[PDB]
Amino acid sequence: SFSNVPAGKDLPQDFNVIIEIPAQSEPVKYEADKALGLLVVDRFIGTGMRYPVNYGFIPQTLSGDGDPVDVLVITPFPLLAGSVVRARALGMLKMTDESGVDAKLVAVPHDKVCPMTANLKSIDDVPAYLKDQIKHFFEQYKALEKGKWVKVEGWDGIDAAHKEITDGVANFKK
Amino acid sequence: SFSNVPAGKDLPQDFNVIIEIPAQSEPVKYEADKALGLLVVDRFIGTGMRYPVNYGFIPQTLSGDGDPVDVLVITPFPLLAGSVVRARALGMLKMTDESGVDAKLVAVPHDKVCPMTANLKSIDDVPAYLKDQIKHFFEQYKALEKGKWVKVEGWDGIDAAHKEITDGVANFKK
Amino acid sequence: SFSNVPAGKDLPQDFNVIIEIPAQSEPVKYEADKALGLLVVDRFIGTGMRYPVNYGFIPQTLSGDGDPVDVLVITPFPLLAGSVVRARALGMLKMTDESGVDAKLVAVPHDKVCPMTANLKSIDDVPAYLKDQIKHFFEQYKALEKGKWVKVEGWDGIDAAHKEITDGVANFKK
Amino acid sequence: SFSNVPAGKDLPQDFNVIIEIPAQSEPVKYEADKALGLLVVDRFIGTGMRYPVNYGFIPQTLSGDGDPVDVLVITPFPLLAGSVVRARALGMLKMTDESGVDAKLVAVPHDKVCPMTANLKSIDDVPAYLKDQIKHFFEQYKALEKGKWVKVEGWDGIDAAHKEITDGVANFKK
Amino acid sequence: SFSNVPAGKDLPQDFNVIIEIPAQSEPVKYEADKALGLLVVDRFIGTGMRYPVNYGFIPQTLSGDGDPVDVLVITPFPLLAGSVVRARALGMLKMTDESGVDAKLVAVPHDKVCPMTANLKSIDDVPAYLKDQIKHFFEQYKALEKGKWVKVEGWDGIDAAHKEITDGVANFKK
Amino acid sequence: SFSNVPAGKDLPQDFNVIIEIPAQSEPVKYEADKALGLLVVDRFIGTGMRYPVNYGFIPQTLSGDGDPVDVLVITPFPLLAGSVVRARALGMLKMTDESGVDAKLVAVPHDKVCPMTANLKSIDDVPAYLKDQIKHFFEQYKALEKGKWVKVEGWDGIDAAHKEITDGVANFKK
Ligand SMILES: [K+]
Ligand SMILES: [K+]
Ligand SMILES: [K+]
Ligand SMILES: [K+]
Ligand SMILES: [K+]
Ligand SMILES: [K+]
Ligand code: NA
Ligand code: NA
Ligand code: NA
Ligand code: NA
Ligand code: NA
Ligand code: NA
Ligand code: NA
Ligand code: NA
Ligand code: NA
Ligand code: NA
Ligand code: NA
Ligand code: NA
């Protein structure tokens, strides 16, 4: 299943995201097992906080931590966990957590998939209130797990997102 | 996954439907990718309109357009996207859209799966209000996508549904 | 999919459960098809009654009836149907139904997956009201299906749960 | 609020129902307080069972037990708790419980409010599966409360419903 | 209840809206009864179509048709039916229906109530896709009721909204 | 409506709570207007955080800030906004915010209303994970509103809750 989905139709700018956690879903952290082809319950989020936007990963990528490249996808209605969405990048949130460096991309679907998000061209177009909510979420969601923490370094734009994607694709192929 | 599900236990009258879109779900059009084994987001429906009944397809069939045979399944509670339901036919809605001829079957589950729908023997037993809603849905849901349109030709009964199924099974095997 | 998930990381006490029916979901009985890798609609529950806790099975086990070992998993929020949860046993409900002996385990997730349930050490820690609801559910949910019935024999503890799991693993390997 | 709503525009056949419990709502029994004008939590249902159809009462009536006349209203989507619906009668369920005789009417909205239910002319038109679910609900929902019980005597038709309504209106005026 | 809520703290620009229909709620048209103080079920929408944004009215106003001034309020999450929201105007949709002229205002909450909508200053700031959905909704939702119809004339801005509000307040006082 | 509900049947230990915000509801802060008898939208919570338990107030009380006494009510399913629940106290959370001292009670329903919570006798019986979530919620929910802040001082028990209630009742009567 998950293992055979292409990273994208035209990398890095035209990529695929497998959804693990729908926006506003009850506070349960699922992670795709690429060796089982199934979503696995990683943990019940200690704080009870919910992802403000959809969360998933790009298949066939391997990030700095040995996990696939992480992606937040903004949509007008939550997406189904375990579904695939063709997406494009807006930018990224840079952070470090208990396991070291942690960048997450911020994306929207392809314009023909989601006309509603077509006018979001870069991270600067995302409403400030949403940006602020995403940043608060990552700063606070691990507050009640011993040994876990997050510091947000800052936002970066589309070119940085594309580097992260090209690196991830390369690293995965070895 | 999807590719290996049989078209049915006793074709054409006793067939399987893989669900893509639960009745009344938020207005997001998923399509099964039979080569990925996963549901893929085709588009956010432009009008925000919702399927009035469950929508899916018969696996191992190939309709006139090169897609599997499409099915609307009526149930007392929505079905899970990506699940399989053993079904029987009531009839069909005949239409033409921007890509040519487009028939969709109307079905209910097998009587032992859904005793609640056992008294629906043919399309004529479906409440007129539901029939009318389904027809309005197909007439209007594509209203806000350029280049897309639908004209409803009319309803047909169980024998026409069975032909569509037998043709689809034959065509798929080449 | 389902067929390749291990029964557990350290049997019998540390096992995996694939979820078929989320706690409080609409009254539709799904069963995993291990040969299709998909959830299948077994039936619309005749009484309209809902599982009071999550329901699923241990993969790679084979119980007395030729089905995998059944498990009720208690969580603070319902789990996703078709997901996998690492679990530990609390005890079991002993019953006989129309097809003979029927034991179901009662479990919670691993403590690092669900800290919220860490203080449930055995079946005796489960609130009496929940115990009573589970027992009423099994006594009544089949009331409206001809030829189906259930008598509850009683509760048993962790050691009995572990026997059921070890037997199931052994039986599956032939 | 509740106290000033008329029992109906043309009694007994054209009456009003104030909704206390939406069909399929979580298992919490609300009762309108006509002296507070507010819904009050009577109890968490011990069995966790849910009303299969909407439940409420006719204002300005006084039944045999000193409570207003009780009504089950069938609709295609649940109604809002605390809302008012213009309705007509289909029949009634006769029962006795721990507090003596207990009849409940079965109704649908006025035809111009709910065209979808226009073809239900009497209790005999209600699907058998729904009838059976309603009867099971009342037989079982109090199973886990000490001192509470219900025996179902049987169904009766529109004329009996109308008597119950005329009596209730008369009794309320003293 | 409803009858005593002020039309606004500083008319016409700072006004109150009582919500009758939450955005995306199941397709049931409630109307506030100002003489009962309660929401009343007007009808089950024939097409099954849902309001794309919250819908309600300004209390203590009387529009051209003898009903209070109608308002669509855009929010990031649906509002509770029967609740009150302090709002400001963006513009209006002009229409005529079976009962003659029908203008509906488009509004957002006060900036301190909803910071998320602060950057919407006029109707021109509303995304085109949302504008298009609202217009499609009114063009189509009455399609299945005999004797009912709607033609959309066009959009107008904040000053026209304010006139409609001042007229409504004046007309209500006689 | 709200203004005429008694503070309780036997104060301070047997009191009434009017619910403003159901546990886990979308992140919108409603406040009862006792002069309108209606729920009013105070604000969209800036952080998007949700109340982990039901939130409301005791009618006919007047706390140190000039608002009624605030109460968190723990239940197995969320309660309806605007409903009334007979409750008993477990303890209280002591805090100071931007407007000075701020104590909130923690309660459960009367034992006959909610048998499921009967074994919670005091604040010390509440699971630590829930206690921790409630405290995190109040520490963080106002993070994104300028001029607003909260420091948690600590927990206190049933006797302190009862003082707060007796003071509130006295203060309200002048
Ligand atoms: K490229
Ligand atoms: K055949
Ligand atoms: K072991
Ligand atoms: K009459
Ligand atoms: K003014
Ligand atoms: K006392
Ligand atoms: Na990362
Ligand atoms: Na991380
Ligand atoms: Na087709
Ligand atoms: Na088509
Ligand atoms: Na079993
Ligand atoms: Na069984
Ligand atoms: Na009665
Ligand atoms: Na009764
Ligand atoms: Na109007
Ligand atoms: Na109109
Ligand atoms: Na306070
Ligand atoms: Na405060």
Numbering used by the authors:
A (entry chain A), B (entry chain A), C (entry chain A), D (entry chain A), E (entry chain A), F (entry chain A): 2 to 175
Task: Give verbatim lines from the article.
The bacterial enzyme inorganic pyrophosphatase may serve as an example for this approach, since it exists in a hexameric state that requires conformational flexibility for its essential role in converting inorganic pyrophosphate into phosphate. Moreover, whereas all bacterial inorganic pyrophosphatases function as a homohexamer, the eukaryotic cytosolic and mitochondrial inorganic pyrophosphatases function as homodimers. Hence eukaryotic inorganic pyrophosphatases have different oligomeric interfaces than those of bacterial enzymes. This suggests that it may be possible to inhibit the bacterial inorganic pyrophosphatase safely by targeting its oligomeric state rather than its highly conserved active site.
SSGCID has solved the high-resolution X-ray crystal structure of inorganic pyrophosphatase from the pathogenic bacterium Burkholderia pseudomallei, and a subsequent FOL screen of this target identified several fragments that specifically bind at multiple oligomerization pockets in a molecular interface between the two trimers of the homohexamer.
